[PDB]
Amino acid sequence: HAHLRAADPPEAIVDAAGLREIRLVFSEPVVDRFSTFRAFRLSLPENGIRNLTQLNTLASELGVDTEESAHHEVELESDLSSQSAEVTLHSDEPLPAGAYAVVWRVLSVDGHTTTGFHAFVHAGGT
Amino acid sequence: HAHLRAADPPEAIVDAAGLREIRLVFSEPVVDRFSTFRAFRLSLPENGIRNLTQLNTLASELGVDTEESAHHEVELESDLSSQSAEVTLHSDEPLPAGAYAVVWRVLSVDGHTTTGFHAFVHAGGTA
Numbered sequence A: 001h002a003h004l005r006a007a008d009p010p011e012a013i014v015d016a017a018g019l020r021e022i023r024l025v026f027s028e029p030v031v032d033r034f035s036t037f038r039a040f041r042l043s044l045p046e047n048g049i050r051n052l053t054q055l056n057t058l059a060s061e062l063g064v065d066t067e068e069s070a071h072h073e074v075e076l077e078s079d080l081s082s083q084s085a086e087v088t089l090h091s092d093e094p095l096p097a098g099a100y101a102v103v104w105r106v107l108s109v110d111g112h113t114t115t116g117f118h119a120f121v122h123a124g125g126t
Numbered sequence B: 001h002a003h004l005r006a007a008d009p010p011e012a013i014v015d016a017a018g019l020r021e022i023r024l025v026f027s028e029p030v031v032d033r034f035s036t037f038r039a040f041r042l043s044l045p046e047n048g049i050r051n052l053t054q055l056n057t058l059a060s061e062l063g064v065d066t067e068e069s070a071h072h073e074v075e076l077e078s079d080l081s082s083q084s085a086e087v088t089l090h091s092d093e094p095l096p097a098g099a100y101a102v103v104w105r106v107l108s109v110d111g112h113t114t115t116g117f118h119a120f121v122h123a124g125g126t127a
């Protein structure tokens, strides 16, 4: 099973003006053909959120079967062509400021499928 | 003493695209002249912050006697003329995304001076 080991940006509030890519590192290599990744700019509730636990709750319902027209999907392209523990997902332009979730379903080289998510807050501009 | 009773935006990560005013409500009216308000776009450490305690720590260091050339001051004006418990701060331009601290020193009608700050994270843009 491939679990997330590390991610940049991390699960934090970051500035990072000009951020345009997210890097994920898994605990084992994942297989390109059966691994998919999506990202969403999360809608915050009126009057905001106070901690990362609350951020995770927003992100925790998203998945690779999320309906794009029901959310604010960010189109990204992966660098995953073979099998790799590291995955880079890029946008064509800087990511706008916002709270974000990356969600995935990955097939490990060991043959097992896992899902997960990673969330962060981009409090810098373009 | 005029203690902060509420602020909008609150101490939170908010979206608020187009934000360009901050509201403070105090427990007693504050007096112009001796009450002043400033705001700063906070530099985050590399790799960012993980909670509002860390935000408050960043903000807690600033004050009405902060030297603007060592920080990233947001130009704003207050609406405080007539002794009031409610103070609205209008930024010259819409606030960029970022972490912010509002700092003050206020003189209450009761004659006591207090200092404080309020911090929040603006995760929306200017439009």
Ligand SMILES: [Cu+2]
Binding pocket: A001, A002, A108, A110, A111, A112
């Ligand atoms: Cu496995």
Ligand SMILES: [Cu+2]
Binding pocket: B001, B002, B108, B110, B111, B112
């Ligand atoms: Cu008093």
